[PDB]
Amino acid sequence: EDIPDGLPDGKLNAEVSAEDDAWLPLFLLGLYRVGRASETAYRTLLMESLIK
RNA sequence: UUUUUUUUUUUUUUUUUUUUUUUUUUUUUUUUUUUUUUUUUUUUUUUUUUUUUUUUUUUUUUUUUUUUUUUUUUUUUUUUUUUUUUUUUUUUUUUUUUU
Q1: Which of A9, A13, A20, A32 is the S-S candidate for A24 at Cβ 3.0 to 4.6 Å?
Q2: Which sign, positive or negative, has the C-alpha torsion A27, A28, A29, A30?
């Protein structure tokens, strides 16, 4: 269901990686769970993410 | 290995003794750490007796409203990758015993 014209405002391009797929989608999906937390003491989910 | 009082020279056995002694008593007197005399509330000028009082007052109550120091919405293990579950294990051993 290709979206209508709401294309985001991009920025400049950094150094080309083409290899970070081993962590970057996992990092975003785990950051979703970290954002779902509500206690600062329960921010050990972030530490578990970094350990992972 | 050997041993088994952290016993022992032989003597001895009151951390007793010159002799004399025995109130860490005594000059003789004495014996309220009493006393000039006379006194005896560390009472008193006369008044006086709420460290009461201007009058008025008397929630150190009140603008009107109000009355979870509740609430975006959604929610409700300050659970979870999967797998697991002696903060057990080389093997051999098992008085931190022995000449």
Answers
A1: A20
A2: positive
Closest-lying nucleotide for A30 based on CA to C1': B81
Which technique was used to obtain these atomic coordinates?
A: cryo-EM
Token readout for A6 is 């709401």
Contact yes or no for A46/A34 (Cβ under 8 A): yes
Report residues 13-52 of A contacting strand B, contact meaning Cβ closer than 7 Å: 39, 41-42, 45, 48, 52
Residue whose pair of structure tokens reads 């785990």 in the numeric block: A30
Amino acid code (one letter) for A32: Y
